[PDB]
């Protein structure tokens, strides 16, 4: 389901280290998991603030809430970097 991407990311990080199908299974579970987690909080944040739309501002706060200390700081940076490129990169 994500195998394509996770493999693409793998080569990007270790361009010589392969990954097993069973290990790929795990990676896929991980991706779906934290997706479900983040979108859950994001959705929760939106209802609390009586907003009908999930902004990126919700994904961010959700990320701050769910992710550990410094692991969260990067995720925010990466997301802002990414969002900003996309928006400007019309």
């Amino acid at each position: 389901s994500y195998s394509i991407y996770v493999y693409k990311v793998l080569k990007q990080v270790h361009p010589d280290t392969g990954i097993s199908s069973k290990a790929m299974g795990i990676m896929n579970s991980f991706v779906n998991d934290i997706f479900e987690r983040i979108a859950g909080e994001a959705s929760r944040l939106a209802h609390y603030n009586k907003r009908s739309t999930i902004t990126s501002r919700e994904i961010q706060t959700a990320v701050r809430l769910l992710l550990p200390g410094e692991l969260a700081k990067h995720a925010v940076s990466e997301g802002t970097k990414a969002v900003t490129k996309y928006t400007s990169s019309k």
Binding site: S20, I54, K90
Partner: protein
């Protein structure tokens, strides 16, 4: 051009966008939402995949098996919290 490339990402922005609305999480999800989420997903993937790849080398192998993901996740103090109540099959 691709939304995934416009955002300089590997993870499918589009797919993530579909999942956000299908999921019935929101009424309407914004434009940057999936791109931010896709971004975080790719990041975390790279992170654990990196540490995992290291452990694979440290033993003796080239293929990353669950044991590596496990050893990887459990050894990083920060990643261990995130996946605290997670069970790695064959980990």
């Amino acid at each position: 051009k691709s939304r995934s490339s416009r955002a300089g990402l590997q993870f499918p922005v589009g797919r993530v966008h579909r999942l956000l609305r299908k999921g019935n999480y929101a009424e309407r999800v914004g434009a940057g939402a999936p791109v931010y989420l896709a971004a975080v997903l790719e990041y975390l993937t790279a992170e654990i995949l990196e540490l995992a790849g290291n452990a694979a080398r440290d033993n003796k192998k080239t293929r990353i098996i669950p044991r590596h993901l496990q050893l990887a996740i459990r050894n990083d103090e920060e990643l261990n919290k995130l996946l605290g109540k997670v069970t790695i099959a064959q980990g």
